[PDB]
Design a protein around this motif. Structure first.
Motif, PDB file in Angstrom:
ATOM      1  N   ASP B  43       0.943  -1.762  -0.415  1.00 19.55           N
ATOM      2  CA  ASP B  43       0.202  -0.053  -0.039  1.00 19.55           C
ATOM      3  C   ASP B  43       1.039   1.343   0.213  1.00 19.55           C
ATOM      4  O   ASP B  43       1.844   1.625   0.845  1.00 19.55           O
ATOM      5  CB  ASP B  43      -1.109  -0.045   0.896  1.00 19.55           C
ATOM      6  N   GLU B  44      -0.084   2.154  -0.046  1.00 24.60           N
ATOM      7  CA  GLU B  44       1.132   3.531  -0.823  1.00 24.60           C
ATOM      8  C   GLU B  44      -0.035   4.417  -0.123  1.00 24.60           C
ATOM      9  O   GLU B  44      -1.500   4.404   0.072  1.00 24.60           O
ATOM     10  CB  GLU B  44       1.474   3.889  -2.080  1.00 24.60           C
ATOM     11  N   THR B  45      -0.144   6.036  -0.376  1.00 26.75           N
ATOM     12  CA  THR B  45      -1.012   6.563  -0.209  1.00 26.75           C
ATOM     13  C   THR B  45      -1.865   6.356  -1.492  1.00 26.75           C
ATOM     14  O   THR B  45      -2.036   6.005  -2.468  1.00 26.75           O
ATOM     15  CB  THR B  45      -0.440   8.465  -0.886  1.00 26.75           C
ATOM     16  N   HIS B  46      -3.287   6.184  -1.178  1.00 28.01           N
ATOM     17  CA  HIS B  46      -4.531   5.591  -1.635  1.00 28.01           C
ATOM     18  C   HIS B  46      -5.869   6.524  -1.442  1.00 28.01           C
ATOM     19  O   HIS B  46      -6.546   6.525  -0.456  1.00 28.01           O
ATOM     20  CB  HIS B  46      -4.492   4.178  -1.738  1.00 28.01           C
ATOM     21  N   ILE B  47      -6.080   7.578  -1.578  1.00 25.11           N
ATOM     22  CA  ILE B  47      -6.912   8.984  -1.189  1.00 25.11           C
ATOM     23  C   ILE B  47      -8.065   8.890  -1.908  1.00 25.11           C
ATOM     24  O   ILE B  47      -8.415   9.672  -3.269  1.00 25.11           O
ATOM     25  CB  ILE B  47      -6.390  10.119  -0.548  1.00 25.11           C
ATOM     26  N   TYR B  48      -9.081   7.948  -1.749  1.00 26.97           N
ATOM     27  CA  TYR B  48     -10.172   7.825  -2.658  1.00 26.97           C
ATOM     28  C   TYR B  48     -11.780   8.956  -2.500  1.00 26.97           C
ATOM     29  O   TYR B  48     -12.361   8.630  -1.081  1.00 26.97           O
ATOM     30  CB  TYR B  48     -10.543   6.588  -2.045  1.00 26.97           C
ATOM     31  N   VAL B  49     -12.045  10.127  -2.907  1.00 25.60           N
ATOM     32  CA  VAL B  49     -13.404  10.667  -2.786  1.00 25.60           C
ATOM     33  C   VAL B  49     -14.010  10.138  -3.310  1.00 25.60           C
ATOM     34  O   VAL B  49     -14.901   9.847  -4.163  1.00 25.60           O
ATOM     35  CB  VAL B  49     -13.315  11.694  -4.257  1.00 25.60           C
ATOM     36  N   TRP B  57     -20.217   3.863   0.526  1.00 25.92           N
ATOM     37  CA  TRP B  57     -19.040   4.565  -0.299  1.00 25.92           C
ATOM     38  C   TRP B  57     -18.951   4.036  -1.683  1.00 25.92           C
ATOM     39  O   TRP B  57     -18.164   2.816  -1.626  1.00 25.92           O
ATOM     40  CB  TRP B  57     -17.784   5.252   0.623  1.00 25.92           C
ATOM     41  N   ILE B  58     -19.327   5.194  -2.412  1.00 29.31           N
ATOM     42  CA  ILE B  58     -18.597   4.925  -4.015  1.00 29.31           C
ATOM     43  C   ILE B  58     -17.568   5.842  -4.196  1.00 29.31           C
ATOM     44  O   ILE B  58     -17.940   7.261  -4.484  1.00 29.31           O
ATOM     45  CB  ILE B  58     -19.974   5.498  -4.608  1.00 29.31           C
ATOM     46  N   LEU B  60     -15.991   8.938  -6.262  1.00 29.43           N
ATOM     47  CA  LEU B  60     -16.314   9.914  -7.639  1.00 29.43           C
ATOM     48  C   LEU B  60     -14.738   9.386  -7.763  1.00 29.43           C
ATOM     49  O   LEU B  60     -14.910   9.387  -9.757  1.00 29.43           O
ATOM     50  CB  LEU B  60     -16.525  10.727  -6.310  1.00 29.43           C
ATOM     51  N   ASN B  61     -13.664   9.480  -7.575  1.00 27.05           N
ATOM     52  CA  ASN B  61     -12.577   9.327  -7.888  1.00 27.05           C
ATOM     53  C   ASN B  61     -11.245   9.016  -7.251  1.00 27.05           C
ATOM     54  O   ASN B  61     -11.576   9.753  -6.086  1.00 27.05           O
ATOM     55  CB  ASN B  61     -12.088  11.066  -9.017  1.00 27.05           C
ATOM     56  N   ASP B  62     -10.449   8.942  -7.440  1.00 25.80           N
ATOM     57  CA  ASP B  62      -8.660   8.736  -6.393  1.00 25.80           C
ATOM     58  C   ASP B  62      -7.752  10.288  -6.761  1.00 25.80           C
ATOM     59  O   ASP B  62      -8.387  10.654  -7.784  1.00 25.80           O
ATOM     60  CB  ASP B  62      -7.863   7.829  -7.182  1.00 25.80           C
ATOM     61  N   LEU B  63      -6.829  10.251  -5.896  1.00 21.96           N
ATOM     62  CA  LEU B  63      -5.999  11.483  -5.726  1.00 21.96           C
ATOM     63  C   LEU B  63      -4.683  11.474  -6.067  1.00 21.96           C
ATOM     64  O   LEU B  63      -4.023  11.590  -6.052  1.00 21.96           O
ATOM     65  CB  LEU B  63      -6.612  12.247  -4.476  1.00 21.96           C
ATOM     66  N   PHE B  64      -4.737   9.794  -6.145  1.00 17.90           N
ATOM     67  CA  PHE B  64      -2.641   9.387  -5.957  1.00 17.90           C
ATOM     68  C   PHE B  64      -1.739   9.589  -7.512  1.00 17.90           C
ATOM     69  O   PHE B  64      -0.942   9.729  -7.028  1.00 17.90           O
ATOM     70  CB  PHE B  64      -2.533   8.253  -5.537  1.00 17.90           C
ATOM     71  N   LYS B  65      -2.793   9.631  -8.269  1.00 18.63           N
ATOM     72  CA  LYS B  65      -2.403   9.792  -9.294  1.00 18.63           C
ATOM     73  C   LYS B  65      -2.125  11.125 -10.179  1.00 18.63           C
ATOM     74  O   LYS B  65      -1.201  10.795 -10.941  1.00 18.63           O
ATOM     75  CB  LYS B  65      -3.444   8.955 -10.983  1.00 18.63           C
ATOM     76  N   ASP B 107     -17.560  18.683 -10.044  1.00 17.06           N
ATOM     77  CA  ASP B 107     -17.775  17.538  -9.552  1.00 17.06           C
ATOM     78  C   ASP B 107     -16.960  16.776  -8.578  1.00 17.06           C
ATOM     79  O   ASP B 107     -15.863  17.548  -8.791  1.00 17.06           O
ATOM     80  CB  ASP B 107     -18.017  16.356 -10.782  1.00 17.06           C
ATOM     81  N   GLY B 108     -17.084  15.332  -8.362  1.00 16.19           N
ATOM     82  CA  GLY B 108     -16.426  14.986  -7.260  1.00 16.19           C
ATOM     83  C   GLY B 108     -15.530  13.940  -8.220  1.00 16.19           C
ATOM     84  O   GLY B 108     -14.439  12.624  -8.012  1.00 16.19           O
ATOM     85  N   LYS B 109     -15.726  13.410  -9.716  1.00 18.18           N
ATOM     86  CA  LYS B 109     -14.589  13.041 -10.322  1.00 18.18           C
ATOM     87  C   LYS B 109     -13.777  13.424 -11.226  1.00 18.18           C
ATOM     88  O   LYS B 109     -13.004  13.185 -11.001  1.00 18.18           O
ATOM     89  CB  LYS B 109     -15.765  11.714 -11.619  1.00 18.18           C
ATOM     90  N   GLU B 110     -13.921  14.629 -12.406  1.00 17.04           N
ATOM     91  CA  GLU B 110     -13.302  15.165 -13.103  1.00 17.04           C
ATOM     92  C   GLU B 110     -12.296  15.822 -12.584  1.00 17.04           C
ATOM     93  O   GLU B 110     -13.179  16.872 -12.384  1.00 17.04           O
ATOM     94  CB  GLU B 110     -14.471  15.490 -14.656  1.00 17.04           C
ATOM     95  N   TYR B 111     -11.672  16.096 -12.415  1.00 18.94           N
ATOM     96  CA  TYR B 111     -10.458  17.278 -12.241  1.00 18.94           C
ATOM     97  C   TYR B 111      -9.769  18.015 -12.681  1.00 18.94           C
ATOM     98  O   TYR B 111      -9.078  16.887 -13.469  1.00 18.94           O
ATOM     99  CB  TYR B 111      -9.569  16.091 -10.910  1.00 18.94           C
ATOM    100  N   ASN B 112      -9.221  18.829 -12.350  1.00 18.74           N
ATOM    101  CA  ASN B 112      -8.382  20.004 -12.846  1.00 18.74           C
ATOM    102  C   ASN B 112      -7.307  19.869 -12.489  1.00 18.74           C
ATOM    103  O   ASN B 112      -7.947  20.619 -10.842  1.00 18.74           O
ATOM    104  CB  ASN B 112      -8.842  20.921 -13.592  1.00 18.74           C
ATOM    105  N   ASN B 113      -5.901  19.808 -12.284  1.00 16.99           N
ATOM    106  CA  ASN B 113      -5.313  19.765 -11.493  1.00 16.99           C
ATOM    107  C   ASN B 113      -4.005  21.117 -11.762  1.00 16.99           C
ATOM    108  O   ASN B 113      -4.268  21.768 -12.721  1.00 16.99           O
ATOM    109  CB  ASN B 113      -3.753  18.463 -11.615  1.00 16.99           C
ATOM    110  N   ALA B 114      -3.085  21.223 -10.969  1.00 16.83           N
ATOM    111  CA  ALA B 114      -2.429  22.441 -10.856  1.00 16.83           C
ATOM    112  C   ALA B 114      -1.602  22.384 -10.354  1.00 16.83           C
ATOM    113  O   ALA B 114      -0.994  22.676  -9.027  1.00 16.83           O
ATOM    114  CB  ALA B 114      -3.433  23.671 -10.576  1.00 16.83           C
TER     115      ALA B 114
END
Lengths: 276, 315
Positions: B43-49, B57-58, B60-65, B107-114
């Protein structure tokens, strides 16, 4: 050794405060400062014979104070047994230590012979003025220059507040042998706090005694033996003064180096165990 | 006196556990921020939204990628109902030049990063971890903040250097604002732990390991006044407000066994996670509106259980 340190510095002031009556002897301080070199050699290196495994014991404080970056009692036994080895090492180089400091009795009193007078009812005070003023009086201004009483209020507050972190944070953390080691460090700085505290009372009492006694010494005369009584007496003022302040600086360096040490210890535990 | 409190219950499941989790209201959807604080072999960081869609819990998207390995990290989310800004910055050893990374979505799924770079962060010798925050309007704009606490001071030289709040002005794009908090109960030798600033109704509130209700003083200097919630082994662990009066739960022991909630010194009902061998830790007074609320804690492995609140005033 503390009365040896008084003894060495005492006979240094009997030495120089004897040999500055003769104003033509301005270059003999090369020879006697060279004997201060000699006692730093012999005295300091004999007391570093114990620093083979006492410098290894500073490394044993390193063995203590980080596992990374019960046996408190059990290797505390080894620590105190090797402290019987400490005062044993002082006890069996004690031959050498007494040879050194009583050799300062030797060269010291043989420099007390070097004082003389043209007449004994009245003599020069080129000596105690030139050596007190040109060698001592600025250190008198150094220890006079510091409110180490309000700094004892600071270090007092260091033990108070550090007992507050010890109180609420031992009251919270407790868990591993960290608390035992922290308490060893804290009581260590409390014993050193006693040292600092009374030697600050040597500052407040004895420095004022230098203030009182200093009027009867320079720019005057005596029937010669009373002047010599103030060479020995003021040499004792100088001995406890200098010995007390050199103690104050060794424990000052070790003190505030330990202040950053235990300071980052209180800024070291939550970083590990992560409270919440 | 005259208050009607309609309290009720619900149930969630999760297949794997998540110890420290974050909870809020976004468009009236129950969300979550999971924890995988495992840096090991499998296991690594796996922060699930995670959204709870009606049972469980469903993700919506992950954060580690996005943030590859940076860092520990410390998570900060600001709840606008259209957008939530998430930053990730690691634990404290030398460096202040701290390139972090910024998230955006609607949303909870489609993320823009910065890619951002918070170089020379001013929270050196400040202590922070992850928590939920809100907007907070001072006269010009609503604002987002990052409030680093001083854990220990030797001398009480100033009550201004206790909590250091770097603030933004542009959703968290640029943080060109630093905000001072004054704490008047600063007892020396008492190293305050794990500051939790929550936001209630465009006002300030700090909480830590005591409670301080907090108010404005200056444009950047604020203050906190003192307020009791302490009784016999009855610590304060989370509090929300409805109609600006508190709602109180307790940690009665050191095991966080069953939290104790009162009807504002009028009535009382009891948290019952047995009618096992676990607790009531992680309790979240989730704020909905002026009159409704929620409550979710962490009892055992992967089981969350909702306590839902309906509360207005009949007189």
């Amino acid at each position: 050794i503390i009365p040896h340190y008084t003894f060495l510095d005492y006979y240094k002031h009997l030495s120089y405060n004897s040999i500055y009556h003769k104003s033509s002897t301005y270059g003999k301080c090369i020879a006697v400062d060279a004997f201060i070199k000699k006692i730093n050699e012999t005295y300091d290196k004999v007391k570093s014979k114990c620093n083979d495994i006492k410098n290894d014991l500073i490394a044993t404080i390193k063995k203590l104070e980080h596992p990374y970056d019960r046996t408190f009692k059990k290797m505390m036994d080894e620590y105190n047994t090797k402290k019987k080895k400490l005062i044993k090492c002082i006890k069996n180089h004690e031959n050498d230590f007494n040879k050194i400091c009583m050799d300062m009795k030797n060269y010291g009193t043989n420099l007390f012979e070097q004082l003389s007078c043209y007449n004994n009812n009245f003599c020069n005070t080129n000596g105690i003025r030139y050596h007190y003023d040109e060698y001592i009086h600025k250190l008198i201004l150094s220890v006079k220059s510091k409110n180490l009483n309000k700094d004892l209020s600071d270090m007092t507050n260091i033990l108070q507040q550090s007992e507050l972190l010890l109180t609420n944070l031992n009251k919270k953390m407790g868990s591993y042998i960290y608390i035992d080691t922290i308490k060893f460090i804290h009581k260590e700085m409390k014993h050193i706090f006693n040292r600092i505290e009374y030697h600050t009372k040597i500052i407040n009492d004895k420095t004022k005694i230098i203030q009182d006694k200093i009027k009867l010494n320079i720019w005057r005369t005596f029937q010669k033996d009373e002047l010599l009584k103030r060479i020995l007496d003021m040499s004792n003022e100088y001995s406890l003064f200098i010995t007390s302040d050199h103690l104050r600086q060794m424990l000052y360096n070790t003190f505030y180096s330990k202040e950053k040490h235990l300071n980052n210890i209180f800024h070291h535990l939550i970083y590990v165990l992560q409270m919440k | 006196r005259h208050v009607f409190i309609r309290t009720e219950l619900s149930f969630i499941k999760n297949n794997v556990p998540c110890i420290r989790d974050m909870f809020f209201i976004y468009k009236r959807e129950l969300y979550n921020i999971c924890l995988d604080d495992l840096k090991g072999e499998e296991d690594e960081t796996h922060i699930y939204v995670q959204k709870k869609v009606k049972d469980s819990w469903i993700t919506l998207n992950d954060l580690f990628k996005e943030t590859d390995l940076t860092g520990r990290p410390h998570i900060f989310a600001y709840v606008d109902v259209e957008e939530i800004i998430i930053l990730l910055c690691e634990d404290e050893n030398r460096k202040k030049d701290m390139t972090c990374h910024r998230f955006y979505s609607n949303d909870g799924k489609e993320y823009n990063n910065a890619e951002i770079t918070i170089s020379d962060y001013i929270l050196k010798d400040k202590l922070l971890s992850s928590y939920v925050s809100l907007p907070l309007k001072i006269e010009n704009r609503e604002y987002f903040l990052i409030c680093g606490v001083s854990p220990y001071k030797f001398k009480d030289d100033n009550k201004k250097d206790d909590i250091l709040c770097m603030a933004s002005h542009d959703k968290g794009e640029t943080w060109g604002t630093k905000i001072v908090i004054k704490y008047d109960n600063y007892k020396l030798g008492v190293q305050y732990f794990f500051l939790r600033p929550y936001i209630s109704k465009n006002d300030l509130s700090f909480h830590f390991y005591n409670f301080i209700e907090c108010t404005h003083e200056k444009d950047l200097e604020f203050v906190c006044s003192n307020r009791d919630f302490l009784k016999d082994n009855k610590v304060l662990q989370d509090v929300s407000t409805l109609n600006d009066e508190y709602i109180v739960s307790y940690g009665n022991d050191n095991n966080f066994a069953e939290c104790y909630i009162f009807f504002n010194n009028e009535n009382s009902i009891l948290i019952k996670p047995e009618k096992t061998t676990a607790g009531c830790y992680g309790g979240t007074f989730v704020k909905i509106d002026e009159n409704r609320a929620l409550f979710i804690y962490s009892s055992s492995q992967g089981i969350y259980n909702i306590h839902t609140i309906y509360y207005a005033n009949y007189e």
